[PDB]
Every structure is written in structure tokens, then in C-alpha cells.
Amino acid sequence: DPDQLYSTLKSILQQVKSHQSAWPFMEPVKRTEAPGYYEVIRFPMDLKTMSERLKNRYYVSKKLFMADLQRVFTNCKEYNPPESEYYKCANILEKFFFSKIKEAGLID
Numbered sequence: 001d002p003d004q005l006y007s008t009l010k011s012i013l014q015q016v017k018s019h020q021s022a023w024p025f026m027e028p029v030k031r032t033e034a035p036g037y038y039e040v041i042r043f044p045m046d047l048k049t050m051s052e053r054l055k056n057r058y059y060v061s062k063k064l065f066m067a068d069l070q071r072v073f074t075n076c077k078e079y080n081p082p083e084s085e086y087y088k089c090a091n092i093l094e095k096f097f098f099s100k101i102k103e104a105g106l107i108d
């Protein structure tokens with residue numbers, strides 16, 4: 001059961017990371033790219049951090065994994081204009097994400 005979740009989550013995270021719209025979210029947002037970001041966004045999240053958390057056995061439920069990935073998207077949509085490339089990527093990758101969640105049969 002626990003390594004069952006672990007495997008599923010690792011597979012899903014890896015596919016999200018490989019996706020072509022994942023590039024904005026691969027590492028923590030850099031100050032040099034976004035100077036006042038950490039002044040606007042209280043709970044930053046990215047896919048590198050999510051990989052470490054996964055390896056650190058933090059994702060003991062569906063809901064913890066979903067909340068971190070959802071945070072990636074909602075940060076991006078709070079910070080960035082609606083027609084920005086960053087916003088478009090967020091919605092594209094979110095659709096991909098949900099398709100892989102259904103495909104896995106992942107429930108709480």
C-alpha cells in the first residue's frame with residue numbers, strides 16, 4: 001500500500017516534469033527572473049521541491065501531493081497575467097495532471 005502510493009506518485013510526478021509545459025515550474029522561482037515574487041507569494045512550490053518531498057516520503061496521501069501541485073498552479077495564476085505564457089502553461093499542465101490522476105484511479 002505505501003510503496004503502491006509512492007510508485008504511482010513517482011510515475012505521475014515524472015510525467016508532469018517531462019511534459020513540455022512544465023518548464024516554468026521545474027525549480028524554485030529565481031529572484032533575478034521575478035524580483036518581488038517572494039513578497040507576493042507566501043507558499044512557493046515547484047517540481048524540484050516536490051521530487052525531494054516525494055523522496056523524503058512526505059506524500060503519505062493523495063491529498064498532500066495534490067495540494068503541493070495545485071499550489072504550483074495557483075501561485076502561478078495569482079502572480080502572472082492571464083494571457084501570459086506562464087498562465088497558459090499552468091492550465092495546460094493542470095489538464096495533463098488531472099488526466100494522469102484519473103488514469104491512475106487515485107482516490108483518498
Ligand SMILES: CC(=O)NCCCC[C@H](N)C(=O)O
Pocket residue numbers: 024025029033034035075076079080086
Ligand atoms: C512559475 C512562475 O510563476 N514564474 C514567474 C515568472 C516571472 C515572469 C516575469 N519575469 C515577472 O517578473 O513577472
